[PDB]
Amino acid sequence: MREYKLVVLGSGGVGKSALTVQFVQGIFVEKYDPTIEDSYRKQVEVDAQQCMLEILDTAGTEAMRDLYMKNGQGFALVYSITAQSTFNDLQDLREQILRVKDTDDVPMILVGNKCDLEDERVVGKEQGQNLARQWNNCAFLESSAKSKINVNEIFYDLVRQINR
């Protein structure tokens, strides 16, 4: 059983914790408690393999990021479809990882959260796919921690990429 070090990254309030806790514990975190740094462990099966996931749920604001990126094998970059700045912020995160890893080829997924808040959508699905396309055909998903849509796939996709 291979260990996979996954890192969930993005600006404050996007649902990094909510996504992680839903995935790991099957619970929806309603209260907004800014994260310092939480780590979770979960055994899953991806393409017939028992995998031990270690998921680092990081702070929206943060010298640690460099280290997270050095150590992480796979990164979920999360924005809220509800908040434009959270989407904007993700360029530097993507560029920082590439810098720190010194390679184009880092397992990575773009995740637009708060999909259940369709009404309050500020960021279009197409803007989302457009950003991912441009990022060397990055994996892309819209997700909901509340509704459970595409929660598991975030982590499974990251594993697949690492196995590649």
Ligand X SMILES: Nc1nc2c(ncn2[C@@H]2O[C@H](COP(=O)(O)OP(=O)(O)NP(=O)(O)O)[C@@H](O)[C@H]2O)c(=O)[nH]1
Give the residue numbers of the binding site: 10-18, 57-61, 113-116, 144-146
Alpha helices, H only, the chain? 16-25, 65-71, 84-88, 90-101, 125-134, 151-163
**Residue 17 contacts Mg ion per CB under 5 A:** yes
The single residue listed with the structure tokens 């702070």 is: 59
Residue 46 has which token pair?
């991806």
With respect to Mg ion, which residue has the nearer C-beta, 45 or 62? 62
CB of 103 to ligand X, least distance (A): 26
Compute CA distances 141 → 24, 76, 149, 152, 162, whole Å.
18, 10, 10, 11, 17
Q: How many residues does the chain have?
A: 164
From other proteins, ligand X, Mg ion, none, which one binds at residue 144 (CB under 5 to 8 Å depending on kind)? ligand X
**Residue 12 contacts ligand X per CB under 6 A:** yes
From ligand X, Mg ion, other proteins, none, which one binds at residue 15 (CB under 5 to 8 Å depending on kind)? ligand X
Binding residues (CB under 8 A) for other proteins: these are: 1, 25-27, 29, 31, 33, 35-41, 43, 45, 50, 54, 62-63
